[PDB]
Amino acid sequence: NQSLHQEGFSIPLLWLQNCLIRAADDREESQAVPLVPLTEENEEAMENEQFQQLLRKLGVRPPASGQETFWRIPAKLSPTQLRRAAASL
Amino acid sequence: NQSLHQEGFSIPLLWLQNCLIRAADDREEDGCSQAVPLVPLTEENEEAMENEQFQQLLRKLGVRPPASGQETFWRIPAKLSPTQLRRAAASL
């Protein structure tokens, strides 16, 4: 996590943090939500092995082959779980 | 073109068509040729971008697949002229 900050990935990390926090909030107002990278640098991050290994530790699931493009923040993560993952970034 | 249309991909197709055409409009001014990512924003366009026939079509139109390990999205390459792009959109 911090190691990724050191390889030049701080911007995607903060991005991820926000997606996690918004998911946390929206689950207080029930869906798996896609991590949609809209910039070249975030896109670069999702295709990076170390960043992906991090997404798996936070509990994000990779996309279903042949049916999805984006990783999903699974529905099982509680708003609490999400805020805690975000906070370790 | 047509067969995907018959299999239910008319909405994704319409989307693609709009990407090709808007890209052409930007490339009419000289000096403005950027690669454009095909970003699926709905579950159905996503589903499309993971379909093998939709991809085959994308290759026929001159779209390049993503750089494995760097990109997620297919790109409309910068080299294509407004004419080329418009021809692609019209052939769907």
Across the interface, whether the CB atoms of B70 and A44 are under 8 A apart is answered: yes
Task: State whether residue B2 sits within 8 Å of chain A by CB.
Answer: no
Are the C-beta atoms of B25 and B82 separated by less than 8 Å? Answer: yes
Contacts of B40 in chain A (CB under 8 A): 69
Which method was it determined by?
A: X-ray
Across the interface, whether the CB atoms of A70 and B46 are under 8 A apart is answered: yes
Residues in chain A: 89
Instruction: Name the residue ranges covered by the structural domains of chain B.
Output: 1-92
Q: Please state the φ and ψ torsions of residue B77, each to the nearest 5 degrees.
A: -55, 150
CA distance B1 to B17: 11
Closest CA to B86 of B26, B17, B35, B40: B17
Are the C-beta atoms of B86 and B24 separated by less than 8 Å? Answer: yes
- DSSP notation for chain A: -HHHHHTT-HHHHHHHHHHHHHHHHHTT----EEE---SHHHHHHHT-HHHHHHHHHHTPBPP-TTT-SSEEE-TTS-HHHHHHHHHT-
Task: State whether residue B46 sits within 8 Å of chain A by CB.
Answer: yes
Across the interface, whether the CB atoms of B71 and A43 are under 8 A apart is answered: yes
Judged on CB neighbours under 10 Å (0-12, 13-18, 19+), B87 is middle
Question: Chain A closest CA to B71's CA: distance in Å?
Answer: 6
Task: State whether residue A81 sits within 8 Å of chain B by CB.
Answer: no
Across the interface, whether the CB atoms of A70 and B39 are under 8 A apart is answered: no
Please give the structure tokens belonging to residue A51. 């960043």
